[PDB]
Amino acid sequence: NIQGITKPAIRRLARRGGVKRISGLIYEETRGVLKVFLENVIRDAVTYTEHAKRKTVTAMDVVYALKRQGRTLYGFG
Amino acid sequence: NIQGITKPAIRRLARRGGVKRISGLIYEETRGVLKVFLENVIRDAVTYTEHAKRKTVTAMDVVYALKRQGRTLYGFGG
Amino acid sequence: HRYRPGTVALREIRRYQKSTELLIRKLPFQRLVREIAQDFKTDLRFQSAAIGALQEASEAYLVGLFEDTNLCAIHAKRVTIMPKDIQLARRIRGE
Amino acid sequence: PGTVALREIRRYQKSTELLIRKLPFQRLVREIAQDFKTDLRFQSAAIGALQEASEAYLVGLFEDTNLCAIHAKRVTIMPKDIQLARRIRGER
Amino acid sequence: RSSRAGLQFPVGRVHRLLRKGNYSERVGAGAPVYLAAVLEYLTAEILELAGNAARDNKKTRIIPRHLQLAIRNDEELNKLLGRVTIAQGGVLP
Amino acid sequence: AKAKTRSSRAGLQFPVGRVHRLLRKGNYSERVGAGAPVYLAAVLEYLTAEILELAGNAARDNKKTRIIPRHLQLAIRNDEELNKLLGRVTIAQGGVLPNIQAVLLP
Amino acid sequence: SYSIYVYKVLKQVHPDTGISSKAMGIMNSFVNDIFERIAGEASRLAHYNKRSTITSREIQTAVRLLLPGELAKHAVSEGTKAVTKYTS
Amino acid sequence: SRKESYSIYVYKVLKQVHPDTGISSKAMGIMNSFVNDIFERIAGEASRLAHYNKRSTITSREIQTAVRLLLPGELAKHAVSEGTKAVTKYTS
DNA sequence: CCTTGGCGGTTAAAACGCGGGGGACAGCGCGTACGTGCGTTTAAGCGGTGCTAGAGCTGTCTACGACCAATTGAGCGGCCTCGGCACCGGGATTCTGAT
DNA sequence: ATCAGAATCCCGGTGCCGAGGCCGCTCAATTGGTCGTAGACAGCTCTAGCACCGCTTAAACGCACGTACGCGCTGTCCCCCGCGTTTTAACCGCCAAGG
């Protein structure tokens, strides 16, 4: 499913990041990075979800996980 | 007193940091950086000291400043 | 009379820095998230806002990373970002 | 040129002693602190804490700086490298 | 309360949140007034700049983009929120 | 009856009673469970054990019988998960891990 | 939420300006965030000094620790001013 | 007035894992720093956990979840084992 | 006849002075993957349809938590012992310059 | 290929402040009695969501042909490195200016 994060999408992200030219090897690299990031957040998020004795990950679970990674997110409270 | 942080001392620090070769402009640069660093920690430290109505900066004040700056320091809680 | 190499890229930079919309397609992101989540805890559900939060966070992270990556490439006198640049950026970030 | 440098790297990475002279560091700290509040005193452990923290910080910074120099196919660290490292750190 | 302190932000609510926030065993009378004042001030600064941004873009309403522009183009607000992600804020050109 | 400590009952070396008191007066919650300080004391004890294990190993590697801060640094930094846990922590008098760029080497 | 108070402030500084729902959500996130930073720091300040009461003095010191430069000065001014007015 | 540290407990643990090994005063100071740090991290996270779920009581479950959030991987699993075993034994 | 100034000096560490070495900037020339314009087959956007799933709320039953008086184990003051590794001087081994 | 030169690691010989151990007292942990509010358990509604689908198409990889980006080497010039001279960064133990 990692391949669902397509090349163009990554190019768009890089463009927003101000990148003018992109190596072919970037995309796979990026996917790896993305995967890791997600694994780190979701893990913590789910932990919160299970502490609340729930089966549904809420926006707040995610917010708390991000917050605890020092990746504070505004707009989903 | 920032000049008391000599070229040789900075060279030693860089060596511990694994640096093999050093541009001449580095030292002054380093002095700037360190200066800023100190200003940020000491400021907070003094703030704590002022909050406690003390005239003596304690090790704990420094430790708290470092902690709130995300620079947690071990070994001075005693 | 085709455009010069390095013009459409720049134009795109302008375009996407001028907007705020999510740049990754919803469904593949959803699938990826649920897949990864299955490996931690089973029979999970997700609020749509939860997935949305994850996507905003992920895309913001990737964009910032690409800024730093770009700075590394430019530092090496290049205009082209390489995995090497990303790895340097991530190492200095403490990632 | 380089051999003694490498020697020094091995030497100082092997040891743990403070690399900045105690008394001048003490002076620097008291000067800077004097600029926030006057007639301050210091526990000796406070200054020691400041020096341990400062040197660990500078050393780490020099690691990252070194990586920045090497990335640019150089062996010599320059102010550019420090600035890149600190920018990516979110210090600037 | 808030009327007496000359504030818009709720002094009573802030006080209650302090009491139940597991911060201290007791909470002084002036603490929630002070805190409410600070929060209102910061809110006012951000809404000021973000409102100005909205005028530039010719939209009466304020959207997250305007908040992002306002915050990132202000040095001290930017430092204050250096580790914060504003959803749908995008980045500075 | 004859007094028996909570730490003894829990099979721990770390002080459950003290941990409980610190929880109570740390303004963390209005109430505290009995098991909470037991659990916490156990975790703290365990972590202490892992770090002392590795640091002791490092101390013996240097033909040393006394653990010094250097040994703690070696222990923490050469262990991936401890390094993660203490990624933002400075160990006074710890120095750094020996590490030179192989490429730089002649 | 702080929505009604944020709105009131908005009407003070820009009488003819509104705000989207998302942006309001971001303002709410902001207010809660700064609340936690300041209250948390004040809590630690109180604990370090073995005081059981958080007062306006802890709030002020916490503000000086957390806020940069001019924001700190102005916020401190507003806080003290509000406490003085409330007290009167 | 009385002064307190984790020193004797750290020592006991040390004698458990390395019967013939001692420890400097400074290293002991670093261990005390460590224990206090992790204490604050876990207790703080557990406090937040209790608050998020509208609970007035911190229990071993809050402590456990906090341990899972704060510690990485195997360290977390092992810590969880130690904690759970200690509580189960204590109750009995 | 009673107060508190700066040269004078044990320790050790780098700006000048001359000879010496390793590395950066621009071009020669090579090697090449995407720019720009198309061509094809697939999963997402939008809106439908069926369905099985637990969070907030309320009532039972239970019980450790918090607070207010006795009772007891113990960590360091005060000593009283016991000891770990660097300083001094010397033997054996090793990268680097030189032939 | 080898041969010579300063720096590195451990061994006779040992001691001084760091580390470990008795006696015991006031502080911290435990026992005991009384409210008492909080946790685990059990029941009930239906809304936000899960899984596959109809209509539609934007879109990612490959084709055709070429060029500025990346890189190794050449020609040049361009900046650190080592030992002798000491000194004010400091720190100690004696003169001479107003009372």
Side-chain angles (χ1 to χ4, degrees), chain B residues 67 72-78, chain H residues 26 29-30 33-34 37-38 41:
Chain B
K67 172 91 79 185
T72 301
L73 175 65
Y74 282 3
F76 285 84
Chain H
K26 275 161 171 48
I30 278 133
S33 287
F34 173 73
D37 183 17
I38 302 295
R41 294 195 209 180

Side-chain angles (χ1 to χ4, degrees), chain H residues 19-89:
Chain H
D20 304 319
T21 301
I23 181 173
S24 78
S25 90
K26 275 161 171 48
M28 180 57 76
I30 278 133
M31 295 300 301
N32 283 321
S33 287
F34 173 73
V35 175
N36 285 307
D37 183 17
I38 302 295
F39 185 104
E40 218 309 310
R41 294 195 209 180
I42 292 180
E45 185 57 45
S47 174
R48 282 174 238 113
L49 284 160
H51 190 268
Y52 297 159
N53 292 277
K54 314 274 203 184
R55 297 174 32 76
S56 60
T57 307
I58 283 179
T59 66
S60 60
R61 189 162 181 275
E62 282 69 43
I63 305 294
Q64 174 159 281
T65 293
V67 166
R68 283 199 195 276
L69 291 167
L70 289 151
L71 290 46
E74 292 329 289
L75 263 187
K77 302 184 182 169
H78 290 156
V80 160
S81 286
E82 301 287 68
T84 306
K85 181 177 65 119
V87 171
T88 55
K89 189 205 192 287

Side-chain angles (χ1 to χ4, degrees), chain A residues 1 15-16 29 55-56, chain C residues 12 16 31 45 80 87:
Chain A
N1 285 129
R15 292 289 187 254
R16 181 162 288 163
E29 189 75 4
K55 292 191 160 193
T56 308
Chain C
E12 287 180 3
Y16 290 113
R31 187 179 304 92
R45 325 184 301 181
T80 308
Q87 289 150 26

Side-chain angles (χ1 to χ4, degrees), chain D residues 1-2 4-5 7-8 14 23 27 73:
Chain D
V4 183
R7 187 171 304 143
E8 289 180 4
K14 186 182 291 139
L23 186 55
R27 290 200 211 99
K73 289 196 258 325

